Ligand SMILES: O=C(N[C@]12C[C@](c3nnc(-c4ccncn4)n3-c3ccccc3Cl)(C1)C2)c1ccccn1
């Protein structure tokens with residue numbers, strides 16, 4: 567594999583930074599929690615820095631190609647990703663070949679600036695069948711995983727409510743409550759930097 571997981575202490579400023587981004591970017595969704603469950607906060611159990619030399623070299627290499635095509639600017643963002651493939655992704659990297667061509671913005675790898683948006687995809691599209699144990703999209707017991715990834719957007723194409731990025735572009739920015747979604751069409755345009763193990767918290 568070549569992937570090493572570095573457990574971050576809760577008292578580490580790095581852990582706290584990722585923890586605060588996760589908690590502070592939660593929103594009330596249009597679907598009343600149908601997809602990702604009902605909650606306004608998380609129980610953050612574990613934040614691990616994903617360390618893989620091969621995947622990092624792959625990412626930096628593509629980042630340079632994108633910068634040269636976009637006026638020496640990668641347009642790099644820290645974004646959340648959720649999918650049933652998190653354990654595969656941290657070992658083999660993101661893989662466009664597994665992207666679903668029926669998705670809202672086509673066969674791409676989706677990211678969000680709102681943790682609660684990526685939480686909607688943890689158990690599949692529209693939260694699929696929910697948690698494997700209880701078949702519950704609002705399950706407060708089963709532990710979920712998000713990635714907080716370094717994403718090269720380059721020149722992003724604005725699209726409203728597609729196998730590759732349009733000509734001259736490196737990504738898609740969607741806006742459908744309008745929460746921004748970001749789509750890349752090449753797996754090496756994202757590094758899965760932090761693995762976050764959490765639960766959605768039951769409201770009082
Ligand atoms: O990158 C991998 N998988 C994916 C990361 C994926 C993804 N990203 N965004 C979405 C995605 C998001 C929203 N709408 C439509 N697609 N998907 C996705 C693709 C197919 C089924 C389910 C998902 Cl979540 C393709 C799930 C992968 C899979 C196996 C080994 C290594 N990497």
Ligand SMILES: [Zn+2]
Pocket residue numbers: 697698699700701702705706707708
């Ligand atoms: Zn469950």
